[PDB]
Amino acid sequence: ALTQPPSVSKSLEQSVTISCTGTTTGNSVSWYQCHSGTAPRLLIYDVNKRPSGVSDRFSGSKSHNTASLTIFGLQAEDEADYYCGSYGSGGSLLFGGGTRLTVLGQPKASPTVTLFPPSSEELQANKATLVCLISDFYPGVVKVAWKADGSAVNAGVETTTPSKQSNNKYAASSYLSLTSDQWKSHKSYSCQVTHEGSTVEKTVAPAEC
Amino acid sequence: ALTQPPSVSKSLEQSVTISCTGTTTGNSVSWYQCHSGTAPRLLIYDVNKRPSGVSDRFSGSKSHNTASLTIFGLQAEDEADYYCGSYGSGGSLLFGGGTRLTVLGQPKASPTVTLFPPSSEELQANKATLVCLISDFYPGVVKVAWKADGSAVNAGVETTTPSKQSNNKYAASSYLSLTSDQWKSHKSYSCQVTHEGSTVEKTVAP
Amino acid sequence: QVTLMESGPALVKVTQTLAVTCTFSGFSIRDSGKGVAWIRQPPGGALEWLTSIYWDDTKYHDTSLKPRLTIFRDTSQTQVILILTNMAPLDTATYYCGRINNGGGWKDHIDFWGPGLLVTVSSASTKGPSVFPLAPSSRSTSESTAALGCLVKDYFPEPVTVSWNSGSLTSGVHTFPAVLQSSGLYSLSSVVTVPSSSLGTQTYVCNVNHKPSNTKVDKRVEIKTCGG
Amino acid sequence: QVTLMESGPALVKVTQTLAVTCTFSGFSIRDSGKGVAWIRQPPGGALEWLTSIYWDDTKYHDTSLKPRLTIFRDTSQTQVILILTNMAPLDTATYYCGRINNGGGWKDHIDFWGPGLLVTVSSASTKGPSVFPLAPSSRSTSESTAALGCLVKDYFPEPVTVSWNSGSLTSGVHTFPAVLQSSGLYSLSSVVTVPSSSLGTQTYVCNVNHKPSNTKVDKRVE
Numbered sequence: 001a002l003t004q005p006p007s008v009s010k011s012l013e014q015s016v017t018i019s020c021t022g023t024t025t026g027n028s029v030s031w032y033q034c035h036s037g038t039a040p041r042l043l044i045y046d047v048n049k050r051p052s053g054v055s056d057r058f059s060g061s062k063s064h065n066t067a068s069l070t071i072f073g074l075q076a077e078d079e080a081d082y083y084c085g086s087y088g089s090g091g092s093l094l095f096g097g098g099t100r101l102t103v104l105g106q107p108k109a110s111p112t113v114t115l116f117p118p119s120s121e122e123l124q125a126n127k128a129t130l131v132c133l134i135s136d137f138y139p140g141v142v143k144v145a146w147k148a149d150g151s152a153v154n155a156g157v158e159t160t161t162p163s164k165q166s167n168n169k170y171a172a173s174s175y176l177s178l179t180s181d182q183w184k185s186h187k188s189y190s191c192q193v194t195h196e197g198s199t200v201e202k203t204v205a206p207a208e209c
Numbered sequence: 210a211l212t213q214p215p216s217v218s219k220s221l222e223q224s225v226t227i228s229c230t231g232t233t234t235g236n237s238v239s240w241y242q243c244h245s246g247t248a249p250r251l252l253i254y255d256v257n258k259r260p261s262g263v264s265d266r267f268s269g270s271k272s273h274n275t276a277s278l279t280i281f282g283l284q285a286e287d288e289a290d291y292y293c294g295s296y297g298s299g300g301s302l303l304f305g306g307g308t309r310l311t312v313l314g315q316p317k318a319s320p321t322v323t324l325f326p327p328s329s330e331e332l333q334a335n336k337a338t339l340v341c342l343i344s345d346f347y348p349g350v351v352k353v354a355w356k357a358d359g360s361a362v363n364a365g366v367e368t369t370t371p372s373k374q375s376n377n378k379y380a381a382s383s384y385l386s387l388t389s390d391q392w393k394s395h396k397s398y399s400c401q402v403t404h405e406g407s408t409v410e411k412t413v414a415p
Numbered sequence: 416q417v418t419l420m421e422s423g424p425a426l427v428k429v430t431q432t433l434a435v436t437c438t439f440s441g442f443s444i445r446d447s448g449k450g451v452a453w454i455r456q457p458p459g460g461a462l463e464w465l466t467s468i469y470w471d472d473t474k475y476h477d478t479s480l481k482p483r484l485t486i487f488r489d490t491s492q493t494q495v496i497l498i499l500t501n502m503a504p505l506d507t508a509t510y511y512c513g514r515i516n517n518g519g520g521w522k523d524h525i526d527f528w529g530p531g532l533l534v535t536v537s538s539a540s541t542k543g544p545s546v547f548p549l550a551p552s553s554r555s556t557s558e559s560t561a562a563l564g565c566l567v568k569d570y571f572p573e574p575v576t577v578s579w580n581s582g583s584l585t586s587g588v589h590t591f592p593a594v595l596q597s598s599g600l601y602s603l604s605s606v607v608t609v610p611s612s613s614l615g616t617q618t619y620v621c622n623v624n625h626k627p628s629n630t631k632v633d634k635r636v637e638i639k640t641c642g643g
Numbered sequence: 644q645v646t647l648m649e650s651g652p653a654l655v656k657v658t659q660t661l662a663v664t665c666t667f668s669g670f671s672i673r674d675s676g677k678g679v680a681w682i683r684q685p686p687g688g689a690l691e692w693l694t695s696i697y698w699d700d701t702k703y704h705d706t707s708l709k710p711r712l713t714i715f716r717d718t719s720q721t722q723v724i725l726i727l728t729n730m731a732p733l734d735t736a737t738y739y740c741g742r743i744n745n746g747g748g749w750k751d752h753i754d755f756w757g758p759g760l761l762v763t764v765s766s767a768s769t770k771g772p773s774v775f776p777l778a779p780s781s782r783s784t785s786e787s788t789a790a791l792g793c794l795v796k797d798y799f800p801e802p803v804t805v806s807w808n809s810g811s812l813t814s815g816v817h818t819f820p821a822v823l824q825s826s827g828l829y830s831l832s833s834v835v836t837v838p839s840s841s842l843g844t845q846t847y848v849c850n851v852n853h854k855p856s857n858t859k860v861d862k863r864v865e
């Protein structure tokens with residue numbers, strides 16, 4: 001095998017058309033969704049047709065090399081992750097690799113941004129935990145285009161699907177760290193944050209406030 | 210499962226005989242022992258064959274169905290539980306109920322005893338524990354008593370039955386417990402063993 | 416309706432075996448066209464199917480795991496067990512049984528779940544479980560937070576909790592996995608979203624302990640006067 | 644060389660399932676009735692053989708339990724394994740694996756036995772230890788006549804163990820079997836010999852370790 005697109009970034013109702021391929025024959029082809037610690041929730045049933053217990057907000061076509069999935073009446077929680085699946089040769093329950101839908105048409109909100117402080121605690125511990133935290137963005141898909149003196153160390157990788165905030169906007173983490181000398185020997189730090197737009201920043205002083 | 214007696218008791222000088230019964234075939238019963246709380250130890254193998262390099266006092270011997278084990282010079286340390294093991298149908302390995310050994314004429318010995326007061330991290334939580342430790346005694350007999358002023362045992366009667374040491378002496382512990390204000394308002398802080406009716410006491414103070 | 420549950424240990428040592436368990440309920444294994452399967456998902460990554468059983472006990476599995484996996488059930492306990500060997504830290508994931516169902520002759524799909532189970536595969540240390548007050552905080556921030564945060568070395572068990580100031584002043588709220596390294600020798604950090612004020616000089620205390628130990632060694636935020 | 648080990652979970656939940664593993668010196672030698680076994684003993688009870696396997700995957704099983712148990716390995720991974728049914732808490736025991744050496748196809752040797760595993764069952768999950776130093780507020784002894792140590796409390800289940808400056812100050816030790824703390828938890832005591840009047844010119848350390856939480860902590864006795 002299966003393969004599917006990255007993020008299909010669009011819409012509040014204007015129907016997004018997700019696809020997967022692999023076995024072009026429709027052979028018990030189907031779809032499912034991944035969301036915050038949930039079951040892999042059913043989207044599409046049969047030889048790729050709509051389930052009995054499931055609403056109008058989606059339609060999977062039988063179609064051809066597209067296992068295609070039309071979507072309607074979108075909302076912020078529908079920035080979940082989307083997966084194909086099929087029946088292959090004997091017992092082969094083939095399964096997807098993800099497409100995180102970005103629901104652009106709901107109103108949106110510009111990012112708000114935290115760099116780690118040159119902290120009063122880390123100045124004793126000799127640390128520079130140069131990690132960034134991000135809040136208040138919509139759409140809920142975001143990336144950090146870091147500015148620094150080339151000092152990229154202590155990297156990390158995530159899927160941001162579960163980190164919706166209490167204020168229904170989204171939040172995220174971005175990964176960078178050194179020792180406390182590098183609050184002073186290096187200085188050009190800024191967490192620069194793009195969420196399909198805005199490109200918001202937060203810099204730091206050489207010492208915490 | 211192999212049927213054997215529950216317990217055996219004899220004088221420290223005496224070469225004790227033990228037996229267990231093979232329900233079928235029997236003429237390949239191995240032997241093992243269980244000093245408690247710990248992995249077991251190999252004894253006699255094949256039939257009558259001495260295990261290589263373990264203590265030489267345990268006695269290679271034979272019987273046709275009453276599979277038999279013995280010690281030459283008996284010693285105090287030999288108080289433990291003793292087991293027969295057997296081949297059986299299709300790899301159905303079979304095993305005994307055990308037999309305990311007691312080594313009489315041995316002196317046991319009066320208790321070594323220690324007592325310790327409650328701790329600050331209990332006092333921060335309105336708690337207190339007194340830790341009473343009882344050790345080096347013989348036989349494996351204990352009863353224990355306390356004098357937190359005139360009061361009875363509180364917030365955990367929590368006391369061991371008798372247990373064997375590295376030597377053939379025996380040990381136990383007890384954990385009389387209080388609130389911190391009960392500790393501060395009491396003034397006698399004492400534990401007493403009563404082992405074999407012998408009076409042996411420890412006490413703590415600020 | 417149908418009902419299921421996901422059960423077993425939260426972690427294991429390297430080289431050992433997975434052993435996890437689930438019972439079919441609210442219908443029966445004798446019911447035609449149905450079956451049961453298993454899925455896993457590493458933290459922050461894609462999901463992965465493993466295996467199946469159908470209404471005739473025809474077992475099957477992804478061949479890429481075949482000497483590593485096996486799947487079994489006991490009628491005498493109406494219970495389905497998933498087995499893995501060569502346990503290695505990367506195999507850290509959620510694991511999940513689920514029902515199978517079909518249309519016509521060999522035309523198959525999945526349709527039910529239990530609560531789900533999260534598992535970390537690990538080398539082991541809770542030696543001196545440290546809690547350093549390293550906080551994504553003070554006026555270093557423009558975030559509707561200056562989230563107070565604590566950072567760890569040597570946890571083995573899970574899950575990890577977080578608390579600061581009973582949450583009393585919080586906004587923009589999420590817990591943020593802020594960093595993580597070394598499965599079951601863990602170094603990691605998480606946060607509470609007090610507002611974008613200056614903070615590091617102030618007398619704050621945290622919890623970030625893991626539920627099975629209830630244990631930490633720790634220090635206050637105010638270690639130095641230069642913190643706002 | 645020869646020594647055996649076994650390991651698995653420190654606790655199992657009431658009506659969940661156990662699994663365990665066993666590795667060794669003496670590596671897959673095809674010797675005199677050579678095999679490996681699993682054995683258990685109920686709390687303070689007799690021994691009970693479960694099952695065993697030999698110099699090829701010829702393998703054999705108890706009549707009374709059969710469906711309750713299953714046995715295999717991945718030979719290349721060099722652990723013997725055991726897998727079981729769902730559990731009634733009576734299945735709590737001291738469990739062991741062991742090495743077999745039965746002659747030409749008869750005559751018993753179980754010629755090595757592992758250090759064992761504290762297989763324990765409850766409806767409840769694990770709880771972590773609290774530790775306290777025990778040295779008294781008022782004192783009267785002199786010379787190396789004294790002994791001191793630490794209390795452990797509030798954990799569940801066992802094992803917890805203690806060492807004395809990473810073994811380096813191990814002398815004149817007493818250790819007591821743990822007791823159930825009456826809320827449904829456990830508690831332990833261990834003690835080492837010390838100079839009565841010379842604490843602080845050297846430090847004496849309770850190196851406490853608790854496998855279920857994997858918690859390991861060092862504290863001064865003085």
Ligand SMILES: *[C@@H]1O[C@H](CO)[C@@H](O[C@@H]2O[C@H](CO)[C@@H](O[C@@H]3O[C@H](CO)[C@@H](O[C@@H]4O[C@H](CO)[C@@H](O)[C@H](O)[C@H]4NC(C)=O)[C@H](O[C@H]4O[C@H](CO[C@H]5O[C@H](CO)[C@@H](O)[C@H](O)[C@@H]5O)[C@@H](O)[C@H](O)[C@@H]4O)[C@@H]3O)[C@H](O)[C@H]2NC(C)=O)[C@H](O)[C@H]1NC(C)=O
Pocket residue numbers: 299300676697700701702703704747748749
């Ligand atoms: C040509 O064609 C030939 C057939 O005509 C082929 O020969 C056959 O080869 C296979 C092995 O490849 C052999 O398999 C048999 O399988 C049985 C079932 O698995 C097995 O029975 C055991 O039954 C109990 C039941 O409770 C289970 O617990 C066992 O797990 C189960 N399996 C096993 C593997 O054990 C048969 O067992 C044989 O071995 C035991 C050995 O036990 C004795 O020795 C022990 C030594 O320590 C001792 O401790 C014991 O106390 C015993 O004294 C014997 O007891 C059995 O009688 C039996 O011999 C067995 O594995 C067939 O039996 C072979 N047939 C013949 C006639 O030999 C040949 O390979 C083909 N070649 C080609 C090129 O095609």
Ligand SMILES: *[C@@H]1O[C@H](CO)[C@@H](O[C@@H]2O[C@H](CO)[C@@H](O[C@@H]3O[C@H](CO[C@H]4O[C@H](CO)[C@@H](O)[C@H](O)[C@@H]4O)[C@@H](O)[C@H](O[C@H]4O[C@H](CO)[C@@H](O)[C@H](O)[C@@H]4O)[C@@H]3O)[C@H](O)[C@H]2NC(C)=O)[C@H](O)[C@H]1NC(C)=O
Pocket residue numbers: 090091472473474475
């Ligand atoms: C003589 O007596 C025997 C026993 O009473 C009768 O049945 C034979 O029994 C053997 C052994 O049990 C059968 O072998 C097994 O067959 C399974 C069925 O496969 C068929 O069905 C699927 C579709 O459902 C087809 O795709 C496939 O091509 C076959 O037509 C197999 O699944 C088994 O395979 C194993 O491997 C796979 C892949 O790893 C796993 O998914 C499976 O779970 C399993 O582990 C296995 O090969 C045999 O098929 C039976 N033969 C017949 C003719 O029925 C006989 O019927 C009887 N003889 C006569 C003439 O009556």
